[PDB]
Amino acid sequence: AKGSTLIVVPFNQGSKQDVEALIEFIYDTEKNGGLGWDLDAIIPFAAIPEQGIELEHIDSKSEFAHRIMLTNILRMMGCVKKQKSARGIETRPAQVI
Amino acid sequence: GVATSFSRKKARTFDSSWNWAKQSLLSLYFEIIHGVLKNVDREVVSEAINIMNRSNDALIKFMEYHISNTDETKGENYQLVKTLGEQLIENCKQVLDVDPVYKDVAKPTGPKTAIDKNGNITYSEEPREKVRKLSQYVQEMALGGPITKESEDALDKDSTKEVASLPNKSTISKTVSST
Amino acid sequence: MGEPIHKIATRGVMLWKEFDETIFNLPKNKLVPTLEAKRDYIISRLNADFQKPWFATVNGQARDLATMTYEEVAKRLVELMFIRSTNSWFDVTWRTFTGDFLRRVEERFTKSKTLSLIQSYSLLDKPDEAIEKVFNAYPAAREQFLNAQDIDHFLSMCQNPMQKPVPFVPVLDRRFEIFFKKDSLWQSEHLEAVVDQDVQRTCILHGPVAAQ
Amino acid sequence: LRAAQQQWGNDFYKRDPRIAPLRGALATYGLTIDDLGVASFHGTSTKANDKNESATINEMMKHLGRSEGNPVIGVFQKFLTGHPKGAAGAWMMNGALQILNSGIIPGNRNADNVDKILEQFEYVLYPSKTLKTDGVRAVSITSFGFGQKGGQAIVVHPDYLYGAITEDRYNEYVAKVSAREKSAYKFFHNGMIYNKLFVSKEHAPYTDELEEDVYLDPLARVSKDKKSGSLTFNSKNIQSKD
Amino acid sequence: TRGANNIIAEGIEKMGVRTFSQKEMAFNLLGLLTPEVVELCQKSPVMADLNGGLQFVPELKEFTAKLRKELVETSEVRKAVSIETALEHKVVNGNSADAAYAQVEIQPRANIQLDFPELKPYKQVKQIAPAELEGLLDLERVIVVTGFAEVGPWGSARTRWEMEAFGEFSLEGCVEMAWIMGFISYHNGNLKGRPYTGWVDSKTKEPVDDKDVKAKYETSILEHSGIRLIEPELFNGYNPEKKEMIQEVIVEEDLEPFEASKETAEQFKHQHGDKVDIFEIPETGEYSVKLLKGATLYIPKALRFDRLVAGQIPTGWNAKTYGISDDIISQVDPITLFVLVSVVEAFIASGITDPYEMYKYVHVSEVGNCSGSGMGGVSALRGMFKDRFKDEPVQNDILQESFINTMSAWVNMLLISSSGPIKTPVGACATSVESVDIGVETILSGKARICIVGGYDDFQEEGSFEFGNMKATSNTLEEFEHGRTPAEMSRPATTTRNGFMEAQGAGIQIIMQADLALKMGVPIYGIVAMAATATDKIGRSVPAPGKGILTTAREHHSSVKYASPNLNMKYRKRQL
């Protein structure tokens, strides 16, 4: 619709450096090479499928999947809180679905 | 798995809706003339919603010119595109400064598993008999079921009439939370 | 094989005799240039006098396979290989030839994989109805000349040795003599299956002295 | 008669400052500026070219009073082929002819996001997908080479020609074309499978004895030679009364 | 939510639970971004249950396992019982009862059309032009396009158009590309005992059916067509990763002497003066050549060049496939072969198989060639500037092959044999549109009645490099940094466009007077209504594109209160 923009980026949610770089990108000013945005909502639906992996079979894939689906979701929230705090934003909270 | 993918340079921006509005209209205009989209299709109402959510003065002149220069005597499909188009132009003027709206008019489907004589398992999304609209979907969601018990539109008949109704904000007499 | 034969001097045999003197006695490197030179004369003689006419003839007018439509080709197969008098195909292999050709018409003019309209060549025992059916499903094949690939297929089917030799000459090339001369004896006993039922097209073996 | 038809039919505007060469060209066949539906753009994917060419077409249409809300549909065929330089406009012309004869208008499938600057040009639309229209009456081809070479050609749907001839002449033509088409398909498929579409001519249609006699008679025409079946100049049809 | 366990969704619903489509579930989640839920979330955390009452089905895993078992078991039984009842029937009633039920499939073969223009019935076509048009036009001054062709990165005009309009090949388009690229060849004779008529793999000589061509070659076809990484084998081993230059050094230490003929020796001597020493070896009569201290010497070195992608004619394309003989191929610049093929394919698209047929209707002085090039035979130019310098074997007559007018010359000397005009424009990227302006004016002047028009250009190393230094072309290393694949590096009118993509090939149209086209009964693909060129203005940038061509729309508007009676076709017909 009118006023709508879509930005597509490559992104491994499994990587800490990509999580920090992406939120830094969104929040950096256009001069510094960012979008100079300020998120109103985050919807972290990234997942990798795990079929047939019971307790005895938990290994590398599972520990990795767990990093995408919990640890880096907390890091992504953390980064948004650090960027908002840095620019002194106390009245525009980002809804996390 | 922890190998970086993100770089600022690979970011692809999409913001040229002013252009895409005019191509969306033209595609609709011709899909109706070539009788790919009929007056009974929900795909016509979905495209109207998407054209109205990109309404500006450029797009209105575009639609005016195309519809006003349609020769309706060239067949039924030309009369149809003219009738709809005239409506769609009126909707687009009433919403020129309104905010664009997420509004789905897709037919709510439900699951159907069939096993034939030979025993081939076929899954299909069939239409739900009671729910043919998202308003009805919310009613059905609000009523729940026995298990959860603890102790007028013109869709699928005349898409031009349903288009006419799009910019009208339906006032709610009594809310679905009371039911 | 170049063996003398006594035949009744019909128009067909007199042609055969003439071609033995002028065309079939030439060396192989001068055969092809001579067939190009005399092409029109050869065709006019075949269509008038001989038992095996020039296949590519539409309503009396000499063509080539390459200047015939797929409709023209199927109707000319039926005209030459199917006997109106007995309402039957003079030979089953001739029907199988004509069916193989109509399946190739379907292949060439169909856009997607489909079911053949000629399911069994038993359907060809009313050939006019079967031709209408194929050329109504694929009406382009009424107006398009043969693909060059389908000419080569048609000539390949004419050389098939598990079928009765075709009752026509489809092309003028090095193999003209084999096309002209093979399977030349039966026509005298089956005049119904010859262009006008005309005995004068046919070879009839007979002795000069026993003729008295 | 021809000069009368040139003065009134073809060249009625060559000395009329009130008619644009572009307007006249269409008006010849009773088409208006609004009937120029597609513009094959040079569209090289450079910053300078793509704004310049949009600006130019836009200013042309604005001056000739093209109806508001009737943009020309941009076609940018070089998203698929790239820029072959010399050959650029020939490819565009081939696609313009394919557009007129199909009504299909190809989209720039690499038009991810149309530059915001181009929004200002109201008389140009930049589709990203293929439109099957009900018919394109005319196409503009524009080029912009190195060394200030600008060019434009208009191509008009061929069915506006047959309005200018009688039914008898048309029907005679349609018959001749149907025959010619059939022979062409024959020639084409034969040439394809035997790798002989290209056949170099060993000899000119005249012998070196007739070369000067043919050059000097403007009514000399080749005939199908009886012996060879090849088209040649016969010495009888050179400076002949008939 | 339903996209595996879709098949039990209906079984779960039968318990009075709700399963959602993705569209319903997105609708539910977008409800959590509405203003009311947002202001709710800002007060205390919000927990939305969008579960559809599934939390009330007791022991859900076993319940869903039961549903899956009683569906798979039911299907599997019915399959096994159907297979045994089919086998029983076949045993008891034999294979002849199952012979009259079987049916024959027709697999399509590629029927490549020449896509002539459809001619309507005279009543339909008389309804689009104004009624006054009859007898108003002079058809000797109406230029029609009667045939066209190209050689380009997507093959012919037929294939290019399939890929441009539909983004994918039909069976006819796929076979045509497979023939062009030399993946398949026709065969008519004995093929491993059996006689065969049809396509064969060009390498294995195994039969290929038309239906099987897409599954077998479409990947290879799409990978080796259009805009793609430069293929060194197509460009005399040119690799833009390794671009060979030579640096000039002064020798410090005297080189090991080397053998050389006598002529090569006094050539070395003539160049270097005292800085070389040549001494006959009395035995054999060769000469020991010793470069001394201070002698100039050239050492090769490679540069990594940043343009790696081009629009190249499909890998496989060979002029032999179209019938051009080896003697012509060895004689001429590669560009000329694109022209020769485009000219015959343009003549076939016009329905003119024998070009001499034109001489049944027009004099030999009435067939023009108005086609041109930006740079002409740039491979011959490499030959005479670089390969001659490096004392490599080069044909003596390479110069004639370089000239832009040489492509037209070969067309006349191999196909047309006209004595008509010859007007070879050079217009860089506007050469084809200038060729149509020249061809139109040539015909309207009376000097010709048929003109071949069009343009052609080759892609070679030196032009690639020089377009890169002008910064005209896209830097391929930048495009890779932006995640762009080759296919998506030409993006006109886009916000991120950053230079053009070099390509090679030809394109030809046959234009002629409408009055001759009707007489000859050739197809008519369009009317050339106008063709015009324009320079721009004072300036110091030769690459700068300008608004000169705006002049085609020049028009006085000082006094426009009343319509000019000229524009009215009734008036003009009344005067005629």
Side-chain angles (χ1 to χ4, degrees):
Chain A
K2 65 199 184 163
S4 75
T5 307
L6 171 65
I7 310 273
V8 180
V9 295
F11 175 75
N12 179 22
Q13 196 169 296
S15 167
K16 183 168 77 63
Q17 288 175 115
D18 273 24
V19 164
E20 290 169 19
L22 179 55
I23 303 304
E24 184 69 60
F25 170 55
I26 293 154
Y27 272 89
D28 258 44
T29 55
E30 293 154 281
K31 190 271 178 183
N32 298 119
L35 314 177
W37 285 10
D38 183 16
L39 294 178
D40 271 302
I42 299 157
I43 304 173
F45 280 11
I48 77 175
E50 300 148 281
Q51 290 93 29
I53 306 148
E54 298 188 344
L55 185 77
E56 66 156 283
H57 295 310
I58 290 169
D59 191 48
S60 192
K61 186 157 189 203
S62 290
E63 175 162 23
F64 177 64
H66 185 66
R67 189 177 209 243
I68 292 167
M69 301 178 62
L70 173 61
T71 312
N72 284 340
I73 294 174
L74 300 183
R75 289 224 182 78
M76 178 180 298
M77 301 180 67
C79 291
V80 172
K81 151 67 198 185
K82 280 194 290 286
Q83 294 289 11
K84 284 174 182 306
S85 286
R87 310 173 155 74
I89 308 164
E90 297 288 316
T91 68
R92 189 184 177 174
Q95 186 176 17
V96 189
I97 310 300
Chain B
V2 301
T4 50
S5 296
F6 176 73
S7 52
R8 301 209 174 183
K9 299 191 176 300
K10 294 201 195 179
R12 300 295 164 75
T13 315
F14 299 105
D15 57 19
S16 76
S17 77
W18 50 274
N19 195 59
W20 306 139
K22 293 192 196 89
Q23 106 165 325
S24 271
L25 175 80
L26 212 55
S27 47
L28 180 60
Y29 187 85
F30 290 129
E31 295 299 326
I32 285 155
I33 287 172
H34 294 325
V36 172
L37 289 187
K38 294 299 190 307
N39 200 32
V40 301
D41 298 0
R42 292 218 194 175
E43 195 56 23
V44 169
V45 183
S46 287
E47 295 334 299
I49 283 150
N50 279 310
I51 289 151
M52 293 162 60
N53 282 349
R54 305 186 275 192
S55 175
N56 51 64
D57 283 306
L59 174 62
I60 286 157
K61 283 180 294 184
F62 191 69
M63 283 180 303
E64 279 165 307
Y65 174 86
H66 278 278
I67 299 314
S68 72
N69 290 106
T70 304
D71 187 21
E72 60 266 41
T73 78
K74 291 182 75 151
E76 293 73 16
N77 286 353
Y78 289 73
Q79 181 61 67
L80 169 50
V81 81
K82 188 130 194 171
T83 286
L84 173 54
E86 275 157 330
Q87 190 47 251
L88 207 152
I89 286 160
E90 286 304 303
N91 299 351
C92 275
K93 282 171 166 149
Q94 292 165 40
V95 306
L96 181 61
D97 57 282
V98 171
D99 293 343
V101 295
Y102 165 51
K103 162 179 223 161
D104 182 64
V105 295
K107 198 180 309 197
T109 62
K112 197 66 164 46
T113 181
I115 309 160
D116 58 344
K117 299 295 94 182
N118 303 118
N120 311 296
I121 306 165
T122 61
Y123 176 84
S124 63
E125 301 273 346
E126 292 286 66
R128 285 185 193 280
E129 67 280 12
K130 296 303 294 174
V131 188
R132 63 182 266 284
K133 284 176 66 188
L134 276 188
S135 69
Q136 289 165 357
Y137 160 81
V138 174
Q139 291 187 142
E140 185 199 42
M141 288 307 99
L143 296 189
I147 197 181
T148 68
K149 191 70 184 173
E150 93 294 350
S151 200
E152 284 282 15
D153 53 305
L155 290 172
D156 315 323
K157 59 181 72 68
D158 199 315
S159 289
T160 307
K161 185 57 63 66
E162 179 54 37
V163 163
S165 77
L166 280 172
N168 304 144
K169 297 293 176 187
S170 87
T171 55
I172 317 302
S173 298
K174 66 181 295 295
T175 66
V176 74
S177 54
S178 80
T179 81
Chain C
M1 294 184 288
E3 290 309 292
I5 312 177
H6 278 124
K7 308 189 160 179
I8 296 181
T10 47
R11 275 193 277 115
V13 165
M14 278 332 278
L15 167 57
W16 185 310
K17 178 164 204 71
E18 173 167 299
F19 281 7
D20 273 359
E21 295 162 20
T22 65
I23 291 158
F24 302 131
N25 71 344
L26 306 181
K28 293 292 182 179
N29 67 286
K30 287 185 182 66
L31 177 57
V32 166
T34 304
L35 285 192
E36 294 165 23
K38 304 197 80 187
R39 176 176 187 95
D40 293 75
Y41 176 66
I42 289 167
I43 290 165
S44 50
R45 296 286 265 122
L46 292 173
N47 276 318
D49 300 331
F50 206 51
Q51 51 191 8
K52 286 177 158 46
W54 176 254
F55 177 78
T57 302
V58 187
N59 304 358
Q61 187 225 3
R63 301 273 192 88
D64 180 63
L65 271 170
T67 72
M68 281 181 93
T69 57
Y70 291 76
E71 201 197 34
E72 285 166 335
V73 165
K75 291 178 163 197
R76 173 65 159 165
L77 280 170
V78 166
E79 179 186 22
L80 286 194
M81 286 180 153
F82 180 89
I83 319 308
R84 290 287 170 205
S85 92
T86 75
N87 195 247
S88 91
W89 288 89
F90 189 70
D91 195 307
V92 59
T93 64
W94 284 6
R95 191 185 68 187
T96 288
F97 182 108
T98 306
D100 285 335
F101 180 77
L102 290 170
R103 285 245 184 84
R104 178 49 75 97
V105 175
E106 298 169 346
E107 291 164 348
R108 180 66 55 203
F109 292 88
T110 197
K111 284 306 206 294
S112 53
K113 171 183 180 283
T114 56
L115 297 184
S116 173
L117 297 144
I118 314 308
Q119 269 307 318
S120 68
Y121 300 150
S122 324
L123 195 137
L124 280 178
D125 290 291
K126 294 179 293 182
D128 294 328
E129 275 67 49
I131 281 182
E132 288 306 288
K133 183 168 190 221
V134 173
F135 293 102
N136 282 348
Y138 299 120
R142 296 206 158 93
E143 307 308 342
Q144 193 157 292
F145 291 164
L146 268 63
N147 195 287
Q149 288 190 72
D150 297 339
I151 293 163
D152 279 3
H153 179 59
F154 181 93
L155 289 173
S156 188
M157 286 200 265
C158 291
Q159 286 157 239
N160 183 19
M162 297 193 61
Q163 74 167 6
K164 182 173 183 65
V166 295
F168 49 76
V169 176
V171 74
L172 302 186
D173 62 335
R174 191 184 50 269
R175 303 165 301 183
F176 179 53
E177 185 164 20
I178 294 95
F179 270 114
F180 188 72
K181 291 193 177 158
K182 72 191 153 71
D183 199 34
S184 44
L185 296 190
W186 64 269
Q187 293 93 356
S188 66
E189 294 214 328
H190 299 275
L191 278 181
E192 63 285 3
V194 182
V195 164
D196 295 310
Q197 297 75 238
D198 183 33
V199 72
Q200 284 295 331
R201 293 170 177 284
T202 57
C203 297
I204 302 169
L205 281 52
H206 207 251
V209 176
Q212 299 180 104
Chain D
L1 172 48
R2 276 175 154 74
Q5 294 173 314
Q6 188 185 338
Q7 156 68 60
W8 292 114
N10 300 77
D11 303 1
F12 66 92
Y13 62 85
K14 292 297 186 292
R15 300 161 38 72
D16 204 346
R18 291 190 58 206
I19 311 174
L22 183 51
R23 165 175 261 129
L26 296 164
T28 285
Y29 310 93
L31 289 170
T32 56
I33 195 62
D34 284 275
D35 291 276
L36 182 47
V38 174
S40 255
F41 278 75
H42 197 47
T44 54
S45 173
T46 80
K47 290 294 192 192
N49 188 61
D50 289 6
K51 178 177 186 168
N52 182 63
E53 189 170 26
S54 284
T56 289
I57 292 289
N58 193 74
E59 188 47 60
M60 280 164 53
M61 300 287 96
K62 188 184 179 313
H63 184 71
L64 296 190
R66 176 107 169 185
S67 304
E68 307 200 344
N70 189 15
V72 306
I73 298 163
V75 163
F76 300 88
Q77 190 197 44
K78 283 184 200 57
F79 84 92
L80 183 65
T81 70
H83 183 45
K85 300 172 294 290
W91 286 359
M92 286 157 65
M93 166 70 72
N94 290 2
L97 298 171
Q98 278 161 322
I99 287 158
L100 289 163
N101 294 292
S102 55
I104 301 165
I105 307 179
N108 178 3
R109 292 203 293 282
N110 281 357
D112 37 279
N113 180 53
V114 169
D115 192 343
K116 180 51 153 207
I117 281 90
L118 296 184
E119 184 182 3
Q120 79 188 300
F121 307 134
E122 289 300 338
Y123 296 103
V124 191
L125 170 61
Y126 298 91
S128 91
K129 54 189 169 55
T130 287
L131 309 154
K132 294 66 60 191
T133 74
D134 66 331
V136 172
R137 278 148 274 146
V139 188
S140 148
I141 298 153
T142 43
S143 276
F144 297 94
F146 299 110
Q148 295 190 357
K149 302 293 275 258
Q152 178 167 51
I154 307 299
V155 190
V156 167
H157 198 279
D159 285 354
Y160 286 85
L161 180 63
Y162 307 129
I165 69 175
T166 58
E167 190 181 358
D168 266 16
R169 189 172 180 190
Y170 187 67
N171 290 333
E172 181 191 356
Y173 163 70
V174 173
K176 270 181 294 202
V177 160
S178 304
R180 184 175 287 290
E181 191 271 87
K182 278 181 196 29
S183 289
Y185 164 100
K186 167 186 174 306
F187 185 84
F188 176 77
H189 278 295
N190 171 266
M192 186 183 184
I193 71 187
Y194 295 123
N195 303 290
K196 67 174 183 70
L197 284 171
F198 178 101
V199 186
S200 90
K201 292 292 194 177
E202 69 282 35
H203 303 295
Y206 39 81
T207 68
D208 298 294
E209 299 75 70
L210 292 176
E211 184 179 353
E212 275 147 15
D213 307 322
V214 175
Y215 289 168
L216 297 170
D217 183 20
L219 309 175
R221 305 287 183 267
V222 303
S223 53
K224 188 175 181 292
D225 191 359
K226 186 179 65 65
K227 190 175 66 64
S228 60
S230 93
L231 299 168
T232 48
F233 286 102
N234 190 21
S235 72
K236 290 190 179 65
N237 307 15
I238 286 166
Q239 293 295 341
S240 79
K241 179 73 73 178
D242 299 332
Chain E
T1 313
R2 314 192 303 280
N5 56 349
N6 281 6
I7 57 166
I8 67 171
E10 184 168 47
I12 285 155
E13 285 204 348
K14 275 164 183 146
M15 304 295 295
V17 173
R18 188 59 160 56
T19 78
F20 311 88
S21 63
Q22 281 163 341
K23 299 204 77 60
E24 287 154 342
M25 188 55 71
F27 184 69
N28 306 329
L29 291 168
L30 286 168
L32 298 179
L33 293 176
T34 59
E36 282 72 15
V37 177
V38 165
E39 70 193 77
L40 196 58
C41 283
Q42 285 177 7
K43 290 173 206 151
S44 59
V46 155
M47 194 148 110
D49 188 296
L50 311 189
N51 198 16
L54 187 74
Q55 72 270 34
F56 296 115
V57 168
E59 195 163 318
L60 177 54
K61 170 201 165 80
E62 184 41 57
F63 177 60
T64 47
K66 180 173 68 69
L67 287 181
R68 200 182 324 283
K69 276 182 187 73
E70 77 179 23
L71 255 78
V72 165
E73 173 59 8
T74 303
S75 155
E76 288 291 11
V77 160
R78 283 192 201 183
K79 267 181 189 175
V81 167
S82 162
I83 299 302
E84 287 309 323
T85 303
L87 285 179
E88 177 141 335
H89 173 272
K90 159 154 285 198
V91 157
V92 177
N93 292 280
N95 296 338
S96 59
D98 307 300
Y101 183 82
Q103 63 270 62
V104 193
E105 299 302 329
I106 290 308
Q107 293 292 339
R109 297 179 134 78
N111 189 30
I112 304 182
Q113 298 301 280
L114 298 185
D115 188 57
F116 274 31
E118 295 193 338
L119 286 158
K120 295 172 151 189
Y122 189 67
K123 302 307 171 291
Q124 281 185 52
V125 76
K126 183 64 191 176
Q127 286 172 356
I128 66 155
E132 306 91 333
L133 193 63
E134 252 196 41
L136 186 42
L137 298 191
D138 169 24
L139 296 192
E140 295 203 320
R141 289 194 81 74
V142 169
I143 309 307
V144 293
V145 180
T146 270
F148 63 90
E150 54 200 74
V151 172
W154 289 97
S156 71
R158 281 187 298 284
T159 50
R160 192 252 311 128
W161 171 255
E162 291 180 63
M163 186 51 64
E164 190 190 340
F166 310 123
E168 73 159 334
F169 289 130
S170 53
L171 179 69
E172 291 77 13
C174 202
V175 163
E176 187 177 343
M177 287 299 278
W179 174 82
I180 285 162
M181 297 176 81
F183 290 135
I184 66 186
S185 313
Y186 187 69
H187 189 269
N188 185 45
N190 184 4
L191 193 74
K192 309 248 194 170
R194 187 181 62 82
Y196 178 71
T197 286
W199 298 113
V200 307
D201 181 89
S202 285
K203 295 183 294 292
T204 77
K205 312 297 188 186
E206 292 304 296
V208 194
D209 299 330
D210 294 286
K211 65 170 176 62
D212 273 15
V213 163
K214 188 168 303 178
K216 183 157 164 60
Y217 295 119
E218 185 70 65
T219 287
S220 314
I221 287 163
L222 293 182
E223 210 179 324
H224 290 296
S225 310
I227 297 177
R228 68 186 193 279
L229 291 177
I230 288 164
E231 303 201 6
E233 67 277 0
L234 299 185
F235 296 114
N236 306 113
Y238 168 52
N239 176 350
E241 306 279 39
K242 202 180 168 232
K243 195 208 159 58
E244 317 299 321
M245 315 197 103
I246 60 186
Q247 201 262 310
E248 182 206 315
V249 307
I250 303 305
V251 165
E252 290 298 336
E253 64 201 331
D254 297 354
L255 274 77
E256 196 175 4
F258 61 88
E259 179 189 19
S261 84
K262 182 174 189 292
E263 294 71 17
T264 316
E266 71 241 1
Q267 271 170 19
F268 279 126
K269 187 69 210 168
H270 187 199
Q271 170 58 37
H272 290 295
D274 65 4
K275 289 288 183 298
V276 68
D277 269 334
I278 59 165
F279 296 124
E280 193 210 15
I281 306 159
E283 289 94 309
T284 184
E286 304 303 290
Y287 278 65
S288 78
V289 182
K290 193 194 186 212
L291 275 288
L292 307 184
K293 174 181 280 191
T296 298
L297 188 60
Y298 281 102
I299 292 153
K301 63 180 195 190
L303 183 63
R304 324 296 137 195
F305 184 50
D306 49 355
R307 279 63 176 171
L308 303 176
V309 168
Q312 305 154 64
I313 288 161
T315 314
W317 195 91
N318 186 334
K320 291 179 62 51
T321 292
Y322 289 95
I324 309 194
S325 67
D326 280 304
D327 44 50
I328 292 164
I329 292 161
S330 57
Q331 174 48 44
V332 305
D333 201 288
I335 187 182
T336 307
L337 298 180
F338 307 149
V339 185
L340 293 171
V341 168
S342 306
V343 164
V344 306
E345 280 203 282
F347 268 111
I348 294 150
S350 161
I352 291 167
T353 74
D354 192 355
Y356 284 4
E357 181 188 18
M358 285 182 288
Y359 306 138
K360 293 160 63 159
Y361 303 87
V362 310
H363 195 229
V364 301
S365 72
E366 279 183 326
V367 182
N369 205 330
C370 310
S371 58
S373 197
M375 280 137 275
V378 288
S379 275
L381 283 185
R382 175 179 48 70
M384 86 176 70
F385 284 87
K386 194 164 126 190
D387 299 358
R388 197 71 93 180
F389 185 51
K390 302 198 304 186
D391 209 39
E392 298 183 334
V394 160
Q395 68 195 70
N396 279 340
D397 63 327
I398 199 63
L399 174 66
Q400 83 197 28
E401 295 311 321
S402 63
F403 295 148
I404 294 164
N405 63 294
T406 290
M407 289 61 95
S408 287
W410 281 113
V411 170
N412 208 57
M413 309 195 314
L414 295 170
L415 304 165
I416 312 306
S417 180
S418 62
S419 321
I422 178 66
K423 284 170 167 162
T424 309
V426 189
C429 335
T431 300
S432 293
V433 191
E434 162 185 351
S435 175
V436 178
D437 195 3
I438 286 171
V440 166
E441 289 313 312
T442 310
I443 289 165
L444 295 185
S445 84
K447 291 182 191 299
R449 299 176 68 198
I450 316 176
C451 216
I452 302 162
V453 299
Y456 27 89
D457 257 312
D458 211 338
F459 172 88
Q460 292 296 331
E461 170 164 6
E462 296 66 29
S464 172
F465 189 74
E466 292 304 323
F467 278 124
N469 286 316
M470 290 183 108
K471 300 207 178 319
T473 46
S474 66
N475 183 341
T476 298
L477 289 189
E478 282 201 296
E479 297 290 66
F480 287 155
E481 274 181 53
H482 297 65
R484 306 276 178 182
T485 81
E488 67 173 302
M489 281 185 194
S490 201
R491 41 188 193 280
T494 277
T495 304
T496 60
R497 62 194 191 279
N498 196 44
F500 77 86
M501 174 59 57
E502 214 168 310
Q504 54 162 4
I508 294 287
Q509 295 87 46
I510 312 307
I511 57 166
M512 55 171 87
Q513 299 177 337
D515 201 287
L516 178 60
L518 293 173
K519 180 168 164 42
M520 288 181 74
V522 292
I524 295 180
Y525 291 94
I527 296 150
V528 185
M530 190 202 69
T533 64
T535 51
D536 310 330
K537 56 163 170 171
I538 287 294
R540 301 283 182 287
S541 180
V542 163
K547 298 184 73 68
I549 204 65
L550 199 60
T551 50
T552 55
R554 68 183 165 285
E555 195 158 283
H556 200 76
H557 291 135
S558 76
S559 288
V560 296
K561 194 164 64 74
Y562 298 109
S564 73
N566 265 292
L567 270 181
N568 176 237
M569 199 182 289
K570 286 165 186 303
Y571 181 72
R572 308 209 304 275
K573 187 55 175 294
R574 196 181 81 220
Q575 298 295 340
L576 178 60

